[PDB]
Design a binder for this molecule. Structure first.
Ligand SMILES: [Mg+2]
Ligand SMILES: [Mg+2]
Ligand SMILES: [Mg+2]
Ligand SMILES: [Mg+2]
Ligand SMILES: [Mg+2]
Ligand SMILES: [Mg+2]
Ligand SMILES: [Mg+2]
Ligand SMILES: [Mg+2]
Ligand SMILES: [Mg+2]
Ligand SMILES: [Mg+2]
Ligand SMILES: [Mg+2]
Ligand SMILES: [Mg+2]
Ligand SMILES: [Mg+2]
Ligand SMILES: [Mg+2]
Ligand SMILES: [Mg+2]
Ligand SMILES: [Mg+2]
Ligand SMILES: [Mg+2]
Ligand SMILES: [Mg+2]
Ligand SMILES: [Mg+2]
Lengths: 151, 51, 117
RNA sequence: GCGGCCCCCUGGACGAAGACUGACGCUCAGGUGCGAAAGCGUGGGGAGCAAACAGGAUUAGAUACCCUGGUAGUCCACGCCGUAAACGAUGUCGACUUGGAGGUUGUGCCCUUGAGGCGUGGCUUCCGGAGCUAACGCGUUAAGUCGACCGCCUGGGGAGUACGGCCGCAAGGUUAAAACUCAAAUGAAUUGACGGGGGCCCGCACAAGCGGUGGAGCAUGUGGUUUAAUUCGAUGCAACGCG
């Protein structure tokens, strides 16, 4: 907005696992307003990732999200002239949501078998740092530190 | 113009240059073409400075 | 090679570019660098960051240089005239005196006309 | 119009009292002199800047604004030119008319203790009373109340132009019409609107996101075209699944 402060309530924690981040991930991954399909797909991918990596269930995806989160983002700014890519500081929640969106879109663009396996593959290659989410992730880091004096 | 700071200068913080005019004279002089301008740049704000 | 053990860095900082050259007290240049040559061709070369990049790039490689204490002297209106020093001092040479030249003409040499844009 | 410092020559202004002349004054057509910048003639000088000119950009075009160079000129001496928004858009001289706050430069009395008190002149800035003014505003430095003389004005354009005279090397300067054409031109101020003026504020306005349209097939309306007729309306937002 422009005058009134806003803030959204907190979605319910993810069923059984109780992961608020996982509940937010199903929100982002949701399509056409169908939580059942999103929940089934996320659980299938989560168990596949856990059994493939030999890691636990809760933090197996936490590692990938930690390793695919950025630090600064370029904001199109033009005070006197044309557009300047001015990098800025990323808020905590904004960083988390941006990494989550990156993972979801990276899984979207794949074609391996189906969402259940594509999400697991994205998580694995994000843990390893050889995926496409990470490939897009390093771009902001390389484009940072361009124009500081401007604001 | 010159800095003579005491032995403890931390990371070489410029405290006396900052207090000095710094770019007082520099900014005063970096302008050009002082012929037809000054006749009209004259006070009249001093006049507006009043209760 | 020469092992001067002391020197002075002349910075020529303007609204268009910044130049930094290390020299001896007897006016003998050893190395130089410019923001334009530091991969900032365009509008960024006039920014303070490109000035410090050139400063550190010229200050690096102190092995063959041998200058331990490196005075500083700046000239012209720079991009703050302080970022280059902030990088150069941390480069390894301690700073004890900075002089500023900024030649101020005591009249004469009618400056160029104004730009009507 | 006049700004580094020093020397020589030289003009004017203001203050202290004292002495002297005794209306010797004010204004001024014609006349004479001075008169920014640009410009002209002769001879020097020429670092920077910069008409003209050349090139590179921008643009639909750009012989312009911008960038890179650059000649005359800008500087000096001696002559000429005599024009500026040469403006305070306010002729000179004299007298009278409530105040307040400053600057600059003299001078008198005093508990003089002080970067202090009390007075008296010259010049100068701002605000304001009566008055004046169409209004804006001026207001003891009047655009207030008066006196002396001079210069100038008589609708807008044509036109400060043509012819003639005078001046100038030239560029041009000065004096200065008529025919013709229009019913207006113009000054101050009020309300609104607008501004590639300023400030503050709001809206899914932007930004941050989701999903779309514009691509394909089909439904429907409209424009256009054709037809015997393709009935009549509706047309930027605010007509086009509208009557
Ligand atoms: Mg220039
Ligand atoms: Mg006369
Ligand atoms: Mg001249
Ligand atoms: Mg000449
Ligand atoms: Mg000559
Ligand atoms: Mg030019
Ligand atoms: Mg005249
Ligand atoms: Mg004048
Ligand atoms: Mg004037
Ligand atoms: Mg007049
Ligand atoms: Mg007044
Ligand atoms: Mg004439
Ligand atoms: Mg004539
Ligand atoms: Mg709303
Ligand atoms: Mg948007
Ligand atoms: Mg279509
Ligand atoms: Mg009808
Ligand atoms: Mg019809
Ligand atoms: Mg009709």
């Amino acid at each position: 907005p422009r005058r009134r402060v806003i803030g959204q309530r907190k979605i319910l924690p993810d069923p059984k696992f109780g992961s608020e981040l996982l509940a937010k991930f199903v929100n982002i991954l949701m399509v056409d307003g169908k939580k059942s399909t999103a929940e089934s797909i996320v659980y299938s991918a989560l168990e596949t990732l856990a059994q493939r990596s030999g890691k636990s269930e809760l933090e197996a995806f936490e590692v990938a999200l930690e390793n695919v989160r950025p630090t600064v983002e370029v904001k199109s700014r033009r005070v006197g002239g044309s557009t300047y890519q001015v990098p800025v500081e990323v808020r905590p929640v904004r960083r988390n949501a941006l990494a989550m969106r990156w993972i979801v879109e990276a899984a979207r663009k794949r074609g391996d078998k189906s969402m259940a396996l594509r999400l697991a593959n994205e998580l694995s290659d994000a843990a390893e740092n050889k995926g496409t989410a990470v490939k897009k992730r390093e771009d902001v880091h390389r484009m940072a530190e361009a124009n500081k004096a401007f604001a | 113009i010159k800095v003579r700071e005491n032995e403890p200068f931390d990371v070489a913080l410029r405290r006396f240059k900052r207090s000095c005019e710094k770019a007082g004279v520099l900014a005063e002089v970096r302008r050009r073409e002082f012929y037809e301008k000054p006749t009209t740049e004259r006070k009249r704000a001093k006049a507006s400075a009043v209760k | 090679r020469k092992q001067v053990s002391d020197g002075v860095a002349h910075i020529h900082a303007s609204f268009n570019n910044t130049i930094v050259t290390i020299t001896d007290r007897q006016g003998n240049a050893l190395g130089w660098a410019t923001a334009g040559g530091s991969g900032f061709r365009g509008s960024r070369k006039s920014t303070p960051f490109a000035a410090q990049v050139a400063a550190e790039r010229c200050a690096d490689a102190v092995k063959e240089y041998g200058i331990k204490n490196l005075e500083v002297m700046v000239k012209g209106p720079g991009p703050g005239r302080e970022s280059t020093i902030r990088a150069l001092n941390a480069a390894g040479f301690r700073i004890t005196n900075i002089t500023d030249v900024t030649p101020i003409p005591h009249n004469g040499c009618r400056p160029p006309k104004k730009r009507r844009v």
